[model samples]
Target: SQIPASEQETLVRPKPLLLKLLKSVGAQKDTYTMKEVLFYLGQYIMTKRLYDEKQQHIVYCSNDLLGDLFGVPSFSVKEHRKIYTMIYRNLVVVN
Candidate 1:
């Protein structure tokens, strides 16, 4: 009833060019509120679950770890439009 690690196939990650939403806090440099972390994670985790959806490849997170390195928010909704807008934009392209 147990699956052996040796029998595990190599995990393949789909790459669809991540469009991160949370870029306010640094993952490594800053601590995050559980709420924010969960919110961002909610978006990301939900996307991955939709295997049939094209947006599944977009990984979301509520940390600034990546931005900390670049000194720019990995993704900033304020920089332009709302996150929903971005998502819709992506969908428009796909459809």
Candidate 2:
């Protein structure tokens, strides 16, 4: 027996907060404000997923964008992952 496409739609999605956060971060070369980051974090907590509707993903912020928000020199995939883990761990502990 073959499963119908419509039935597939009823299946649960791969919902995860990490996925939603990466999605919202997107491929924008824009700097994120502190306030904006706070809001994004809140949304991530609520939705429990990182991928946004646009299906975009974020590895690291552009050097210019990073500088605009923080005095940081730049960012990379490794750095991004490292920081995210630390932040997430700290938040989890706080809660």
Q: lDDT of each model, Cα atoms only?
A: 0.35, 0.37
Model 2 / residue 3 / CA error / Å: 63
- TM-score top scorer: 2
* Model 1, residue 82: C-alpha shift (Å): 32
Clashing residue pairs for model 1: 25-64, 26-64, 27-64, 27-65
**Displacement of the residue 92 alpha carbon in candidate 2, Å:** 22
lDDT tens digits, residues 67-91, model 1? 3322343343333344443333321
Please tell me which predicted candidate would have the highest lDDT against the true structure: 2
Q: Per-residue CA lDDT of candidate 2, range 2-66, in tens? A: 67855532212112433344356451323343334445544543354323334334322333323
Cα miss at 36, model 2 (Å)?
Answer: 0.3
